[PDB]
Structure 1
Amino acid sequence: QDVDFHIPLPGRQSPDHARAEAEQLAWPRSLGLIRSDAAAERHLRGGYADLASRFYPHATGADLDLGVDLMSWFFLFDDLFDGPRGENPEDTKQLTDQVAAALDGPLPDTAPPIAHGFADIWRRTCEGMTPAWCARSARHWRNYFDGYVDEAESRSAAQYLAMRRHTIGVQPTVDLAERAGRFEVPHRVFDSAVMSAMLQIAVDVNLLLNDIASLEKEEARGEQNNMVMILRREHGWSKSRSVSHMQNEVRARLEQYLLLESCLPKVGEIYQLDTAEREALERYRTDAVRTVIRGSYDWHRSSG
């Protein structure tokens, strides 16, 4: 909670958010993901419908619900690896595969509820979008899953960031902004060195914000796979020099984000984007990439 940062983007949040936070439970309940009332309340206090409403400021009604549900599923799924299952590449994969199976076709009734939940989400993420968009999203989900498997394997900052960039969930998050918004950035521009650089900054910034906010919690339990802990190790720094340096890393990433944003008009020329395309890319910049950057910061300033 509350550490100062340099984030020059407009804070926004969906006008339909309250109604969204109110009906939050019907979904995870009906899919067996939350059984008892104390678990429901343990959920309400993570504040996932709030975060959804900042990542997806442009959404409403069922489109906002799909985001709320993604946010819920995200944390529910993450819990299942807090156990012993998290240090054995084979129990992780064991699970992973049953969830990732949903990307290829229908699931056997005997699949865990965390996998039927995911399928309900994906069935809704893709309906109405184009086949190619759909396939690009699926590719992203599979690395997410493999991210968890390559993490269980582990029993260096550049090595830490390396594995963390997949497990964080940013990309499939951003992908959902397109679906909720009902638009799609030009596929050829999505693959561009400039945009993927903007995407790598959204990811990096998110895990640095995240690692700072939860500093006192993972510390009390001995975890050494946290940016702060790792930064004192590699460099031999005091816990306060490790935190300032991260604020710096963020500040510098945000500076550059803006630099890249200015190269965007020229990038649209290079790809000879037409009028509609030039616009879908504008939406993507302001409604998907920006919101994932700012939404998280605004959120860590009250909830979760």
Structure 2
Amino acid sequence: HIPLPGRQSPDHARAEAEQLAWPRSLGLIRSDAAAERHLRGGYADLASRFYPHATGADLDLGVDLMSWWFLFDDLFDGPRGENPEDTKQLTDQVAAALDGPLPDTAPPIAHGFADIWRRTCEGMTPAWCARSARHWRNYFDGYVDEAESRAAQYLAMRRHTIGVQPTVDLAERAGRFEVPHRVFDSAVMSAMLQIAVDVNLLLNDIASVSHMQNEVRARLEQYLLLESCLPKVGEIYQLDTAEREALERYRTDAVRTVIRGSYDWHR
């Protein structure tokens, strides 16, 4: 039960046909078998549903983030994912791209992230990049915390490793807009983003138990309640005409798409 319209970028065919060129050029995919395994994931299709408002190079950046993220998560399914020290050793080299240029000795997965992070920040305000860099560190730090494992207790850990916030951040960059920063920090928007995080991880774990389906139903109903409060929220923070349009873009092209896009991709 998701009362949100399914949407997909009109440039999804070209983005899916060219998805392999970027990971091959950064050494993330080096064999024809690895390429076919990547195409079987449908990651470009997922990006076209997360970012239906993006075409061309903007959508290609969304495809690359999906390609990089699943290539990154697969590097921890072996013995390294069980040892938290080796997990932090790799995430530190990736997260170092948020602090400055990476040394040439960095693994290819690190140079890949740096290329994505460089394109994510172009054209965005300095305060937006600092906030988005902060969101990545929260994911990497939560990735190390989850590695230190070798109902409410699992939510506090999975809410950072589900990666919804860095996905939503790219929708702003892909749409070339920024939600008003004081509205992002609002209690209403935080509750909406918390719903988008909780629903995404509940749907991903589906891969006595009907209690989870009703939890998704309840949070989606609460999400609609919070959406109706946004007009009054815009007045509380004294939004102008352009800021209200950016807030509307953020609601439809970033938060709504990250909830509906994951459902249509899993199904």
TM-score clears 0.5? yes
User: Aligned-pair distance for 1:277?
Assistant: 0.5
Question: Matches of 1:84 and 1:151 in 2, distance apart?
Answer: 14
SS at match of 2:206: helix
Deviations 1:62-84 (A, max 9, x none): 00000000000110000111011
Q: CA deviation at 1:89?
A: 1.6
Residue deviations 1:116-167 (CA, integer Å, cap 9, x gap): 0000000000011110000000000000000111011121x11111111111
Task: Using the TM superposition, give the Cα deviation of residue 88 of structure 1 relative to its aligned residue in structure 2, in angstroms.
Answer: 1.6
CA distance in 1 between partners of 2:70 and 2:64 (Å): 10
- The CA deviation at 1:213 is 3.0
Q: 2:246 aligns with which of 274, 280, 284?
A: 280
- 1:291 has 2:260 as partner: no
Tell me how far 1:255 sits from its aligned partner. 0.4
Length-normalised TM-score, structure 2: 0.99
Pairing 1:268–2:234 present: yes
CA separation in 2, counterparts of 1:193 and 1:273?
Answer: 16
CA distance in 2, matches of 1:160, 1:85: 21
Deviation for aligned residue 1:212: 0.6
User: What are the Cα deviations for residues 188-245 of structure 1, in whole angstroms up to 9, with x where unaligned?
Assistant: 000000000000000110011111139xxxxxxxxxxxxxxxxxxxxxxxxxxxx311
Residue in structure 1 matched with residue 173 of structure 2 by the alignment: 179
2:193 is the counterpart of 1:193: no
- Please provide the CA RMSD for this pair: 1.2
Q: CA deviation at 1:281?
A: 0.3
Question: Within 1, Cα distance between the matches of 2:78 and 2:93?
Answer: 18
> Shift of residue 283 of structure 1?
0.4
Which aligned segments of 4 or more residues in structure 1 are displaced greater than 6 angstroms? none
**Could you say what secondary structure the match of 1:111 adopts?**
coil
Alpha-carbon separation, structure 2, partners of 1:281 and 1:43: 35
**Within 2, Cα distance between the matches of 1:134 and 1:276?**
20
Cα distance in structure 2, aligned partners of 1:62 and 1:264: 31
How far residue 113 of structure 1 moved from its aligned partner, in angstroms, is 0.3
- Counterpart of 1:213 in 2: which secondary structure? coil
- Deviations 1:259-301, CA, capped at 9 Å, x for gaps: 0000111111110111110110000000100000001111112
In structure 2, what is the equivalent of residue 161 of structure 1? 155
Decide which of 207, 212, 216 is 1:246's aligned counterpart.
Answer: 212
Structure (1 or 2) with the larger CA radius of gyration: 1
Higher relative contact order (CA 8 A, sep 6+): 1
Structure 2 unmatched runs, 5+: none
Q: How far apart are 1:87 and its partner, in Å?
A: 1.6
Tell me, in whole angstroms, the C-alpha distance in 2 between the residues paired with 1:11 and 1:79: 28
d(CA) in 1 for partners of 2:2 and 2:232? 24
**In 1, Cα distance between equivalents of 2:219 and 2:69:** 26
Within 2, Cα distance between the matches of 1:164 and 1:73?
20
Corresponding pairs, count: 267
The equivalent position to 1:209 in structure 2, one of 203, 206, 210, is: 203
CA distance in 2, matches of 1:175, 1:160: 24
Gaps of 5+ in 1: 1-5, 215-242
Deviations 1:32-82 (A, max 9, x none): 001100000000001000000000000000000000000001100001110
Identity within the alignment, %:
100
TM-score (norm 1): 0.87
Distance in 2 of aligned mates of 1:158 and 1:73: 30
